[PDB]
Amino acid sequence: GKMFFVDLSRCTACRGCQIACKQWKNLPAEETRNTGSHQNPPDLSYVTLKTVRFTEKSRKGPGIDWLFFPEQCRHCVEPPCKGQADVDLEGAVVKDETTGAVLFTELTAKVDGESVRSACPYDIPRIDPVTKRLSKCDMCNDRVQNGLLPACVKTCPTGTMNFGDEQEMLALAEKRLAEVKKTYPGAVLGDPNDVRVVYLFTRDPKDFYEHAVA
C-alpha cells in the first residue's frame, strides 16, 4: 500500500498542511481565540482533520527546542477504530486494500462515536454534534487513487511531508533516521511496524504530544 514519512526535523510549522487539508475538502473554519499560543485550532475536531501542535522545551544555551507536530490519523495496519466499530456495523469503518487508507463511511452515524475514539490509541476520531458522524484524515484517498499526492504532502515546502509506496517510504525513513541521528542523537521513528504515518521524532515523542505514539 501507500505510506507517509513525516521528518519532523524539517518542520518550520508554516501550517501550509493545515490550510491545504481544509482548502482541498472545503472544510469550514473553527471559532478560535488566542490563549497564549500560536497553536490553533487547539485540538482536532469534526471540521479539523489536522492541526499543528506547538511545544516549547527548555535547553541550556540560547533559544529553545521548538517542537512542531502536524497531527493526522496514522492509518494503522490493524486499526483499533475498525475492530471496535465492527461490533455495531461492519462497514462504518473500512480499510481500502490498494492504498491502506482506514476510511470512516456515513454508517459511523449508527456506531457509538465516543467508543470508537476510545479504541483509538492516538485519540484521532471526532464526532459531529448533529450527524453523529466520525471524521478524521481520510488520507486524501480520492487524490492518491488518481495518482495525486495528498494535499498536506504537496503543499509542504520543507520536505517534512513525504508520500509513496510503503517499501520506498520505509527505505527513506531508515536512511533519514541515520542522517538526522547525527545532529539529534535521540531521534526515533513512531510505531514503524503498526502505522502508515511514520513520524520521525527528534527526541522523546511524548514531548511533541502525549498521544504521539501508541
Next chain:
Amino acid sequence: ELQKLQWAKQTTSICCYCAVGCGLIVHTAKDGQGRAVNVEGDPDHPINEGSLCPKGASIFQLGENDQRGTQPLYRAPFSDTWKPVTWDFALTEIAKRIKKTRDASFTEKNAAGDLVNRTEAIASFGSAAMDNEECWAYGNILRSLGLVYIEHQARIXHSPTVPALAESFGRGAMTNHWNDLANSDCILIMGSNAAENHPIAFKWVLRAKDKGATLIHVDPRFTRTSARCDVYAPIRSGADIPFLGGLIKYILDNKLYFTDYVREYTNASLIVGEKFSFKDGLFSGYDAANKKYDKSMWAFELDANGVPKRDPALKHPRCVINLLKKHYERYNLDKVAAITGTSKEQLQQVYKAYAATGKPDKAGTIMYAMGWTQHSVGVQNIRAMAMIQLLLGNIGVAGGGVNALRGESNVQGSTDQGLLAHIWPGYNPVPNSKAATLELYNAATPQSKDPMSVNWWQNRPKYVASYLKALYPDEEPAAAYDYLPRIDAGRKLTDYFWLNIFEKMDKGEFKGLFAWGMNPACGGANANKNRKAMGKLEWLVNVNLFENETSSFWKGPGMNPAEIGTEVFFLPCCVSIEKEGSVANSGRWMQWRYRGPKPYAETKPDGDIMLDMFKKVRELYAKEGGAYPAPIAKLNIADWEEHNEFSPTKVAKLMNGYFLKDTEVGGKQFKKGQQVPSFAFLTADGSTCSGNWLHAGSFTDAGNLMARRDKTQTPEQARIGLFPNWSFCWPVNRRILYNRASVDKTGKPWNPAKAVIEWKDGKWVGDVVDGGGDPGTKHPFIMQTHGFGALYGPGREEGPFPEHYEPLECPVSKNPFSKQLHNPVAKAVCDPRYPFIGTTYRVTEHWQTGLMTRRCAWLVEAEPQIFCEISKELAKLRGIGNGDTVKVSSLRGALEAVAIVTERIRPFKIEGVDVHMVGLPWHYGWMVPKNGGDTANLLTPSAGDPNTGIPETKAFMVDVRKV
C-alpha cells in the same frame, strides 16, 4: 477523475503574497467562464515544485470571498454610510476632482523661477500588489497629471538596500535567486525570519543543509526560522554593525579573505586621498552646522588621466584594504560579544563557520529582509554585509551573493516602474528643477577613463530618450522632457517621501490622496496621527479588494463621521487570479500569469480602473481646457489597450520597446515596428522606444519570454538551478549578478563543481555573462564607474565604511567604539512610564496589515487575535500569566492583546541593565475580525530621519500592563 476538478479549466498563476513567487494551478468552473473551484501549487514550477505556505494555499478563500467589494462605493462629506454607485459615476466624479485640484494647484515654475510643471495638492500611495504593467502605466498616469509625491511599500523595506548594494556592486537588486540557496555551504540569516516570511525559501535552505551547509540565524527572538537552524545567535536590537564589524576584523586577523578575488575584483588596491581620516566616530570633512559630510574629502588619489591609483601589492598605507584593517581594529570579540549580547564562544563559532566560505570552492550567502534596517544606519548594516561578501569572494558565485529578500510579490517590479518620488521607470532619477534641459540631465552621468571598466550607466541617455519616446512618440525626447514634473533641487529628497506625505497631510497641505492597493490607516507608523490626517483630505480614492481601515477611517475608533468632511471613493479591484500580467519576484524573475475566473461581481483589474479614470480626465481637458494640458493630451495610452480595455500584453511589449523607424544599430538592421531585442539596441536619437530599459529583452519578436514555462537546462545550468528558460529576469536573463567575479582572469570558475559561467572555446557557458568581453579584459562590476566591488564606498551619507552608531536612544548612553553615540548626519522623549523596547514583526499565517488575511477564515482560524510575546522574566515582573489580556501603551497610543509568555523572548543586557523586549504582530485592525484587535502602529513613532525617511517600527518604547 476528481469530481471537484473534472469539468474546470486549468490555468497557471503566481502567488499574490511574498516575493518568492510560487506557482499556482487555478481550476475555474464552466470551462473558464464561472468561479474558481480549487487553487493549489503548480507542481512543474521550479521554485516551489507544488508546495505552498498557508497564505498561498488559502488563495481560493481570498478569491471566492463573500466579503469582497462588489461595486464602487461613495461616502459623501460628513456622511456616516456608503452609497453604492456605478463605475460611470465614480470615475467621472473622480476625474472632476483630479482636474479641479490640478487646474487650481498646478504651478509651472517654483519660487526660484525654474520650470517644474507639477501639482503638490495630490499624493499617491501604492503599490507592490499590482501587476508590473499596471505599476508602470499607473506611474506614468500620475506623472502626466504632474504628481511628484508618488510612493509605496518599497520606501520602508526596499529603499535602504538599493543605495547599499548599488554603492557596493553597482545595482540595488538581490544578487542571486531562491533556487541558488541550495548551492550554499553556509547560510547566514540576519534581519530575516525567512521560514515564516519567505517560507518556500526554506525548501532550498534545507537542501543547502542536506549537502553539508551550516544554517545560522542571528535574531533578538527565537522564531520558526531559529527552530531549523544549526546555530541561533541572539543579538540585541541595533547591535548588527558591531556583529558584522567583528566578523570583518576576524576575517582579516585570521587571513580568511579570498586574496585573488579581493586584489582583482574589489577596490582593495585603490589609493584613497590623504584628505580621508576617521577619529572618535567621525570621518574627515564633517560639517557640525548642517550635520553633513564633505564627501569630496573621501575621494581616491587619481592618476594622470583621472583614474584612481592602484597598488596591486596592497602595501601603500592608504590602500582601501589597509584603511579597512585600521577601521575594524576596534571591533574585538570582547567588545562585540558585550554589546551584541552574543557569547564570545558563539560569536567565534558563527565567524568560524561563515568565514570558512572565504575558500575559493566554498560559497556563503547572507539572507536579510526588513526587520533590522528600520533606522538611519540601515544602509551601513547592508554595506557591512556587502563588504564581508567581497572579502570572502562570495559575490558572483553559486550559493553566495547578498540575498536581499523582497517583501511583496511585485515590490521588485513596482520599484523598477518608479512608483517612488525619486525614480522614473528603469531607475532613471526624477529630474530636479536645476536639470532644466534633457542635455543637462544627461551631463550628470559620471564617466571613467579606465579601459577595463565597462561603466554601463554611460548609456543612460539611450534609456531616458527611449522612455520619453514610449510616453510621447510624436515628440522629440528633448521636447517631451518638458512635459513631466520636476522636484526642487533646493528641498530635501525625503521631503517628497512616505513619512513627509503623512506630515504634510496632517497640516492639510494635500487636497486629494490615492490609496491604491495599500492600507495606510494600519501600514503607516503612528496610526492615530495618520487616521486624523486623512480627515484633512478633501477627496480620497481607495482601490482595494475589501472595505478596510483606510476606506472607512471616518467611522474608525473615536471618529465622528458627522465632523469629518472627506469625500471617499472606494473602487473594488479584482484579485491576482482574476487577471493577466507579470510580477517580478525577489530573484528579478519577471513571471507571466493568466486569468482563471472572471472578475468577481462588478470588480475590474487596476489597469482598467486607472486607464478609464485617465481617459475621463483626458476628455475633460479636451472639453474644458485648463492647466498645462500637453502631458495629458499627448500621452500614448493607445498602445495600452485592445478591444476598449487595458492590455497587459501590449503594455509589456511597449515596456520592452520597439523601433519607431528603420534603424541601423549595433551593426544590425531593424525594420520599423520590430520589438527591441535588448537594451543593447536602444538609441538616444528617438529611433527606439522602451517604457523600461530593464524590460528590453522580456517581450521580443521571439515572443513573451516572461511566459516561458520551460525546464530545459544544460548540465552546468542544472547543477546550480539557473532555469534560464523558465520565465525571464532582468537584466537580459542574467540570473546571478556579477557572475564575471565567479571566474579567474583565464575564465575558469573558482569552484568548477558549482560554476555560474565558464569560458569554453570562445564563449561564456552557463548563466548569461554579466558583461560582454573575453576573460581578464574587463573589471567584473560593469555598473560601477571604476568597475570594482566597493569595500570603501565614499558615496554613502554616513561615511565610506560602516561604523556602529546606536539606533536605540533611551536605554543607551555609551558607544564603546567611539565618542559618537548616535548617527552624526541624522527627538525621542524616553518617558520612564514606557520602559520596555516594543517591536513589531510577522507570523507566517498573516499578510501586511491583515486586510487580506483577516478576511480569510482559515488564516484567522490559526492566528485569530493580536498577541504580545514577552519573556518569562517580564511575565513574573508585571504579574502576567500566559494568555492573560494585557494593555500595551506608548506616547502615541495604546491597545489590548493576548499575552504569549515564552523563553523565545529574553531580556537584553544594555550597559549592565536588564531591558525587556515585548513583541507585537502588526497584522491586525478594527475592521475585521471580531476581537481581532487593532494595528500595532497605534504605538509606533512617525519620527524618521532626513536621509532615509523611515520610521522606527522595530525598537520603540512601550509599557505592558495586565488587565
